[PDB]
Amino acid sequence: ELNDQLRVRREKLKKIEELGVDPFGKRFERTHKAEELFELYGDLSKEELEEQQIEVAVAGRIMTKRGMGKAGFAHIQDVTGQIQIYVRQDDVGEQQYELFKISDLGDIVGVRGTMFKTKVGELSIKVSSYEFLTKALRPLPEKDIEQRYRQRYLDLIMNPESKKTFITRSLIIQSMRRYLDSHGYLEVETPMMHAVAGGAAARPFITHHNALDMTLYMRIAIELHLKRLIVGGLEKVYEIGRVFRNEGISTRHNPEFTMLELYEAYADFRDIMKLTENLIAHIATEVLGTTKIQYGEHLVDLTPEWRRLHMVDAIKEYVGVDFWRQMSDEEARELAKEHGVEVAPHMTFGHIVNEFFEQKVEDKLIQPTFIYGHPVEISPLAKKNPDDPRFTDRFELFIVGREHANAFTELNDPIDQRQRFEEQLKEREQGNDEAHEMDEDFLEALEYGMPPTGGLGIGVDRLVMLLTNSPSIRDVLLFPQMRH
Amino acid sequence: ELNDQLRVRREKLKKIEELGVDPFGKRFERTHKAEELFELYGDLSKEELEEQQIEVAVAGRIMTKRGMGKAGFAHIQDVTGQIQIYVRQDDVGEQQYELFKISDLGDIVGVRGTMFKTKVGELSIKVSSYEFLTKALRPLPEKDIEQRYRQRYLDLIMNPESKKTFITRSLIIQSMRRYLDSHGYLEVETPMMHAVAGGAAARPFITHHNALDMTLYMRIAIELHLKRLIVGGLEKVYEIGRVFRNEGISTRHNPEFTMLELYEAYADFRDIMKLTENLIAHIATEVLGTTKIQYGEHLVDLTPEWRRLHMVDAIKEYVGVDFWRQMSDEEARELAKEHGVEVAPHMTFGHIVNEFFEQKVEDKLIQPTFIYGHPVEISPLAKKNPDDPRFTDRFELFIVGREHANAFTELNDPIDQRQRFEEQLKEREQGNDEAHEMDEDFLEALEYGMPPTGGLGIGVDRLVMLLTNSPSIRDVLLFPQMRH
Ligand SMILES: Nc1ncnc2c1ncn2[C@@H]1O[C@H](COP(=O)(O)OP(=O)(O)OP(=O)(O)OP(=O)(O)OC[C@H]2O[C@@H](n3cnc4c(N)ncnc43)[C@H](O)[C@@H]2O)[C@@H](O)[C@H]1O
Ligand SMILES: Nc1ncnc2c1ncn2[C@@H]1O[C@H](COP(=O)(O)OP(=O)(O)OP(=O)(O)OP(=O)(O)OC[C@H]2O[C@@H](n3cnc4c(N)ncnc43)[C@H](O)[C@@H]2O)[C@@H](O)[C@H]1O
Ligand SMILES: NC(=O)[C@@H](N)CCCC[NH3+]
Ligand SMILES: NC(=O)[C@@H](N)CCCC[NH3+]
Ligand SMILES: [Mg+2]
Ligand SMILES: [Mg+2]
Ligand SMILES: [Mg+2]
Ligand SMILES: [Mg+2]
Ligand SMILES: [Mg+2]
Ligand SMILES: [Mg+2]
DSSP states (O other): OTTHHHHHHHHHHHHHHHTTOOTTOOOOOOSOOHHHHHHHHTTSOHHHHHHHOOEEEEEEEEEEEEEETTEEEEEEEETTEEEEEEEEHHHHOHHHHHHHHHOOTTOEEEEEEEEEEOTTOOEEEEEEEEEEEEOOSSOOOOOOHHHHHHTHHHHHHHOTHHHHHHHHHHHHHHHHHHHHHHTTOEEOOOOSEESSOOSSSSOOOEEEETTTTEEEEEOSOSHHHHHHHHHTTOOEEEEEEEEEOOOOOBTTBOSEEEEEEEEEETOOHHHHHHHHHHHHHHHHHHHHSOSEEEETTEEEEOOSSOEEEEHHHHHHHHTOOOTTSOOOHHHHHHHHHHTTOOOOTTOOHHHHHHHHHHHHTGGGOOSOEEEEOOBGGGOTTBOBOSSOTTBBSEEEEEETTEEEEEEEEBOOOHHHHHHHHHHHHHHHHTTOTTSOOOOHHHHHHHHTOOOSEEEEEEEHHHHHHHHHTOSSGGGTSSSOOOOO | OHHHHHHHHHHHHHHHHHTTOOTTOOOOOOSOOHHHHHHHHSSSOHHHHHHHOOEEEEEEEEEEEEOOTTEEEEEEEETTEEEEEEEEHHHHOHHHHHHHHHOOTTOEEEEEEEEEEOTTOOEEEEEEEEEEEEOOSSOOOOOOHHHHHHTHHHHHHHOHHHHHHHHHHHHHHHHHHHHHHHTTOEEOOOOSEESSOOSSSOOOOEEEETTTTEEEEEOSOSHHHHHHHHHTTOOEEEEEEEEEOOOOOBTTBOSEEEEEEEEEETOOHHHHHHHHHHHHHHHHHHHHSSSEEEETTEEEEOOSSOEEEEHHHHHHHHHOOOOSSOOOHHHHHHHHHHTTOOOOTTOOHHHHHHHHHHHHTGGGOOSOEEEEOOBGGGOTTBOBOSSOTTBBSEEEEEETTEEEEEEEEBOOOHHHHHHHHHHHHHHHHTTOTTOOOOOHHHHHHHHTOOOSEEEEEEEHHHHHHHHHTOSSGGGTSSSOOOOO
16 A cells, blocks of 8 residues: 555655656756647548657656557646657667656656557657656555545546636636726725624634734625725726635535625616626626526526516515515514524514525525515615615525625615614624624725715625536635535 | 814705705716816817717716805816816706705715816816715815825825826736736636645734634745645646735735745746746836836836846855855854844854845845845755755845745655755744744645646735835735734
8 A cells, every 4th residue: 555655656766866867857848738739630640640750849747657568658648638658768768768667657757759640540659758757756546525625636637627627717707807807897905804804794714913913804705995995986996806704614605715896886786787797698608608508407597687586576476475564573573483484583574584585585596586675684784775775775696596696785874884883783792693893994984975886796606616517616616625 | 173074064964865865876877087088178179169069977076166156166086087067056957056065075976067168278067967976974184104004095085196006006917917827827716724824934824713623824825735736737827816924014014915926837947037027027018118117216127138146146246255165054153243144043054145145135136136046944945956955946036125026946856845844843943933834735745746847926016016116015005904
């Protein structure tokens, strides 16, 4: 097992050093990637290749190897795929051949040679120069799901498919910045360490600054500092960055994740709905070529315009209870009991409406849907709806049964905002340890005047999951948080 | 007094509501920015303007106001600048004119009207519709440095040159990603919360995950996880993200900053030198239009190729001391005493060489200089130079007397690497509380084989300071860390 093959690999390490070669290599110049070779010469016949003597230089990890006396084959793998190499002793010389023979699966090498096809028609490289680049002290794993996440590098090597999800992830984010940049939004960087962790309902990670002897909280949202920039007059700003929440992991939750937050002065949540469907459609179109995608067993149509549905109307359609009716908190609690909806001590009418939605409705929303009108009690930073103040002009985007975005007509009334924070502090006294805390610096900012604004927050990891048909967030994160 | 002004603004808020207006506004559609207006017709005589009746719609903060009677003026400011508005009671009507009259400096408004020039020919908007958008409860500052950092929004409103710095910052980062993307590097996101804080010599911020009951350290570098991706076979990766160091602030230090870390398989530190100068020169050319820049009292030429200077040769040129000669630790300590170079208990020849450089040489490196050959003792993750192993194939980029980048031919030998960490542990016991920790997970990764690689780390904030002629990092960070 270990120390077994391990001792052998250490032994070969010394043998290589004794042959006057650096077992960990120097720089190496390549001319092609494996895939490029196939694209360019894959359809040429054995004869055509012999007549063109195309010389190339490539490098990669040895994945397979078969020795045959004075000559041998091996498949080396680079970031684009595998290419077979053929090494003959009489061609590369005794010294280089000795290096080929001592080479192990896992070792990394560089080669120069001419393109040719074997009798089975496999495009290969007839090696003229064999360069040893790096000795692998451990063998490639036996070719479990957890190892893929615990040791991502092994996943990337053994499951060539896996890298594609991450390449696509980069294209998704680049497409996102392209759209926002071209539409006038300024990409900014605001603090990730806050005096007060606000902007969302979540438990924060607490830390300490030694030199300044100060308690800091990793940000649970980007909202409050971006709003300060709107007060500052920047008008259109966005930030795609890490957010941290001290909470358990799930197929859709990781303690550190990437969120897009953006704010636009002079817009309201209806404008943000349009921006959201356009942005996501733009991304899907550029990256996948279409807005009609497959996710799990669902055919999801991301083609704008998406469905708009008030949360109360959603509960009426999917459950049957009509919360448009003015009722007491006690009446709402009774309904919750009758319909199997779990509620907490601090909850009143608004919280209960939301619980009805989350527990009995949201998982049925497969096609992109803008659920709007969130009760005021759970929307401390959103402006109340003018017609019915029990609700706010806020919406959440639901796709394949989960929330992908959250946005609102931002609350810019400082007096109302202070009141919302006071109500949140009261909720905390009643058991809601996720309630928003007071932020006087933020209220001060609002007092200098924040224009009417439309704000948006998108879970980038979740969007990447949707567009790559990944069932878990652990599949779109290179190094997801692992349990002890 | 200020207290008096607050009461007044508080009462005006009530009078506006009494006028049936939402004092915090609704969405407002605009057609132009203040600067666009001047660009499109800042020279068009009042005649043509009067004939064309060019209707426009803008919005912004009232910075100045003047006039009495049934006609008045005001200068509103948007993200691009200021534009004078002319409001006449006989045009907008009684109710709207009353709103104009009650409007305070600081309040935000939207207007629709036609372009025109006053007697003095000042481009202005002849208002046809006056929309009150937001009441400022606090007065704008009457037209302190640290105060501008504490309330960045006030700075952005009162000082237009500051906002430009941040717009330029975004352009610099955009230009950086374009270059890297176009040169084949894959943009990735790796963990910011680590089991073991490694990749640099620095004190970490410590935190705790409750549900997992796990101690986590905010990353002090991005290196170790990116190296895992190189083992993973990704070949070219980069990440521009936040890094956290539990240390005091300075003219070029903030507890959380942005760093670019990049790794390229099959390249060495010389290749990285070229990449670094080409990248920075590219960004300068794109953003400033030239590689000739000004920083403080210095004229800095960023045109490649930059000077390459070995640390030992730099000390010889500036201090008159030669460290190429083989010498004992005591001989080095003797030289340190003679030249007034402070040293710590855990220091030997290698550390002392670096102390000579940092204490007597670095501040004089104004023009871009690649200082290379750092002693192995202070380079635990860099490969030793083949000809003189007392030094490593590492370089730091110095410009205007400070370090902007750190890079090396990566140490891919797992056996050597473990030994480097062991020597680091020894130093920690000798008083070096910034010594690197023993990362078994990282060592395991190298044991599967990491190809020869060239790595780079650039302080983005410092690069932004350089290209925006900002004397402090506090000038290029929207919200720099404030003291208590
Ligand atoms: N820790 C947990 N473990 C298991 N189940 C849990 C759970 N927390 C909640 N659930 C369950 O998931 C369902 C919905 O819960 P909700 O609490 O209503 O929604 P959420 O998934 O927690 O996102 P959040 O409400 O915080 O979004 P936010 O606007 O702040 O932020 C904006 C966007 O950021 C993204 N986002 C938020 N948190 C994220 C995370 N930790 N990881 C990745 N993305 C995240 C999302 O796209 C979100 O729309 C319910 O069944 C609930 O019980
Ligand atoms: N906190 C402090 N306050 C006052 N004086 C101090 C100080 N720390 C050091 N000094 C003094 O500055 C001079 C040089 O000290 P050094 O310790 O050699 O320089 P450094 O600025 O600390 O860069 P470092 O070595 O940590 O960067 P790294 O490659 O790891 O990482 C790669 C790149 O990241 C950037 N970077 C590193 N730390 C940063 C930070 N905290 N903020 C912004 N950028 C940073 C840089 O561009 C660096 O090249 C000496 O006089 C020293 O005493
Ligand atoms: N929940 C959150 O993280 C919010 N800060 C996302 C943005 C909502 C609209 N302002
Ligand atoms: N000291 C640091 O932060 C290094 N991780 C910067 C990169 C050096 C080259 N690998
Ligand atoms: Mg949550
Ligand atoms: Mg939610
Ligand atoms: Mg949400
Ligand atoms: Mg430092
Ligand atoms: Mg240094
Ligand atoms: Mg440095």
